[PDB]
């Protein structure tokens, strides 16, 4: 298990997301589904010139998996996935400018719901999750598990458990008071409200 | 000059964009600036592992160039650009599956303004333009010019004209009744409304 420090600005944004009073927490789902949609666009585009890129799975979809026993909400996509380098480097220098701009926007009166306009929508997961695990598989690399309970660090390890073929699984280990996001009617409402017209099928799993 | 036929679905999308009554045409600028921003993110991401990727130009910006004499609005970016193969792939879009999903969404009550969510935002240019010319230069290919007045075809040719170093120029040949998009105050209003949080400087050029 390798341990890494978040880029300073990402650590600052994470503490802002965890500590700022903001009731409209439900936007985390919109942001994650948006990232899933973008990753799906990427593999679909690559497959136009090289169809073998879909040998790891032809279905391009998003699955929402609530689990009340584990207190987890999992967002699965069969997108392009991330290599070990992207998985690490995403929390590095690339995200510095967008994070810096977002925190400046917030100081100027912008809303936390605008996070996605700064390319850092992923960190909205910390509005509802105490810990986030990212399982990912890109065609050019092995399966890796990224994990962080914030605190300025994250870990990356090889994931040998259950191979996924290709894509990303975002496992949200929900805060004790955020279990409404495990309720079928609540998830349906949020999807209809914020992600009604996504370019890929969204399947809400039953418990 | 090579001439290509659009696939049936992308042809149907362009025809819908041209013929459907939809007054909120100004979203074309948000969509093009969004594509420019994404192309700029791509080159900036690649510049970190390989700094030589910026030898073709270090400045990362978006320029809006109205020209009332030519009746054109040009959107210039110093993004990653597009290869010839990208241009032939419906100007780097997931046009086939994107159109299919977008058409299905429109039938389910979605608005034309949601086009960009389907990876076909570029074709919103046809809300205001009778013809679109795309001049592009990717680090891994030569400079090319893509062009289409819709009508089921597009052309791709090598562009030996003024080099751009790296990036994309989208030249909108405006419809006769869409000249408001050449007005300084109109462009400023649209940029403020739909693109205030763009991560790259947007420069609106002055005329005369």
UniProtKB/Swiss-Prot annotation, chain A:
Signal peptide: none annotated. Disulfide bonds: none annotated. ATP binds at residues 35, 77, 96, 122. Keywords: Acetylation, ATP-binding, Cell membrane, Chaperone, Cytoplasm, Host-virus interaction, Hydrolase, Membrane, Mitochondrion, Nucleotide-binding, Nucleus, Phosphoprotein, S-nitrosylation, Stress response, Ubl conjugation. Coiled coil: none annotated. One of its GO terms (molecular function) is disordered domain specific binding. The keyword Ribonucleoprotein does not apply. It comes from the Eukaryota. The modification N6-acetyllysine is found at residues 42, 68. The TPR repeat-binding motif mediates interaction with TPR repeat-containing proteins like the co-chaperone STUB1. Belongs to the heat shock protein 90 family. Molecular chaperone that promotes the maturation, structural maintenance and proper regulation of specific target proteins involved for instance in cell cycle control and signal transduction. Undergoes a functional cycle that is linked to its ATPase activity which is essential for its chaperone activity. This cycle probably induces conformational changes in the client proteins, thereby causing their activation. Interacts dynamically with various co-chaperones that modulate its substrate recognition, ATPase cycle and chaperone function. (Microbial infection) Seems to interfere with N.meningitidis NadA-mediated invasion of human cells. Decreasing HSP90 levels increases adhesion and entry of E.coli expressing NadA into human Chang cells; increasing its levels leads to decreased adhesion and invasion. This is Heat shock protein HSP 90-alpha. The chain holds residues 17 to 223 of 732 of the full protein.
Curated annotation (Swiss-Prot), chain B:
ISGylated. S-nitrosylated; negatively regulates the ATPase activity and the activation of eNOS by HSP90AA1. It comes from the Eukaryota. Residues 1-208 are annotated as: Interaction with NR3C1. Disulfide bonds: none annotated. It is found in: Nucleus; Cytoplasm; Melanosome; Cell membrane. The modification N6-acetyllysine is found at residues 42, 68. ATP binds at residues 35, 77, 96, 122. Changing residue 77 to A: Impaired ATP-binding. Strong interaction with HIF1A, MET, KEAP1 and RHOBTB2. Loss of interaction with HSF1 and ERBB2. Los of interaction with TSC1. Belongs to the heat shock protein 90 family. Homodimer. Identified in NR3C1/GCR steroid receptor-chaperone complexes formed at least by NR3C1, HSP90AA1 and a variety of proteins containing TPR repeats such as FKBP4, FKBP5, PPID, PPP5C or STIP1. Forms a complex containing HSP90AA1, TSC1 and TSC2; TSC1 is required to recruit TCS2 to the complex. The closed form interacts (via the middle domain and TPR repeat-binding motif) with co-chaperone TSC1 (via C-terminus). Interacts with TOM34. Interacts with TERT; the interaction, together with PTGES3, is required for correct assembly and stabilization of the TERT holoenzyme complex. (Microbial infection) Interacts with herpes simplex virus 1 protein US11; this interaction inhibits TBK1-induced interferon production. The TPR repeat-binding motif mediates interaction with TPR repeat-containing proteins like the co-chaperone STUB1. Molecular chaperone that promotes the maturation, structural maintenance and proper regulation of specific target proteins involved for instance in cell cycle control and signal transduction. Undergoes a functional cycle that is linked to its ATPase activity which is essential for its chaperone activity. This cycle probably induces conformational changes in the client proteins, thereby causing their activation. Interacts dynamically with various co-chaperones that modulate its substrate recognition, ATPase cycle and chaperone function. (Microbial infection) Seems to interfere with N.meningitidis NadA-mediated invasion of human cells. Decreasing HSP90 levels increases adhesion and entry of E.coli expressing NadA into human Chang cells; increasing its levels leads to decreased adhesion and invasion. This is Heat shock protein HSP 90-alpha. It comes from Homo sapiens (Human). The gene is HSP90AA1.
């Amino acid at each position: 298990v390798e341990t890494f420090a978040f880029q300073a600005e990402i650590a600052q944004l994470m503490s802002l997301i965890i500590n700022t009073f903001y009731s409209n927490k439900e936007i985390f789902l919109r942001e994650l589904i948006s990232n899933s949609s973008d990753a799906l666009d990427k593999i679909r585009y690559e497959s136009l010139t090289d169809p073998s890129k879909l040998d790891s799975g032809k279905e391009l979809h998003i699955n929402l998996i609530p689990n009340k026993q584990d207190r987890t909400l999992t967002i699965v996509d069969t997108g392009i996935g991330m290599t070990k380098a992207d998985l690490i480097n995403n929390a590095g220098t690339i995200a510095k400018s967008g994070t810096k701009a977002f925190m400046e926007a917030l100081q100027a009166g912008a809303d936390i719901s605008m996070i996605g306009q700064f390319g850092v929508g992923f960190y909205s997961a910390y509005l509802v999750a105490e810990k986030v695990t990212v399982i990912t598989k890109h065609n050019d690399d092995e399966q890796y598990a990224w994990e962080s309970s914030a605190g300025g660090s994250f870990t990356v390890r090889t994931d040998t458990g259950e191979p996924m073929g290709r894509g990303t699984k975002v496992i949200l280990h929900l805060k004790e008071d955020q279990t409404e996001y495990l309720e079928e009617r609540r998830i349906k409402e949020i999807v209809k409200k914020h992600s009604q017209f996504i370019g890929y099928p969204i399947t809400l799993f039953v418990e």
